[PDB]
Amino acid sequence: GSSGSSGEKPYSCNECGKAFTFKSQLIVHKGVHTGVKPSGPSSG
Ligand SMILES: [Zn+2]
């Protein structure tokens, strides 16, 4: 369980909190928050 050390990442989450080297990587992790259902955009 070696997880923690982090250098520098211009992409970090705000909802739950996290870091990412590339945007895409962050977009995927963000999907867990935004729209927690396949039922398209909850609101709009
Ligand atoms: Zn997050």
UniProtKB/Swiss-Prot annotation:
<feature type="zinc finger region" description="C2H2-type 14">
    <location>
        <begin position="11"/>
        <end position="33"/>
    </location>
</feature>
<comment type="subunit">
    <text>Interacts (via the KRAB domain) with TRIM28 (via the RBCC domain); the interaction increases ZNF268 nuclear localization activity. Isoform 2 interacts with CHUK and IKBKB; the interaction is further increased in a TNF-alpha-dependent manner. Forms a ternary complex with TBK1 and SETD4; the interaction between SETD4 and TBK1 is ZNF268-dependent and leads to TBK1 monomethylation.</text>
</comment>
<protein>
    <recommendedName>
        <fullName>Zinc finger protein 268</fullName>
    </recommendedName>
</protein>
<comment type="similarity">
    <text>Belongs to the krueppel C2H2-type zinc-finger protein family.</text>
</comment>
<comment type="function">
    <text>Involved in the regulation of antiviral interferon signaling. During viral infection, recruits SETD4 to TBK1, leading to TBK1 monomethylation, which is critical for the assembly of TBK1 complex and IRF3 signaling.</text>
</comment>
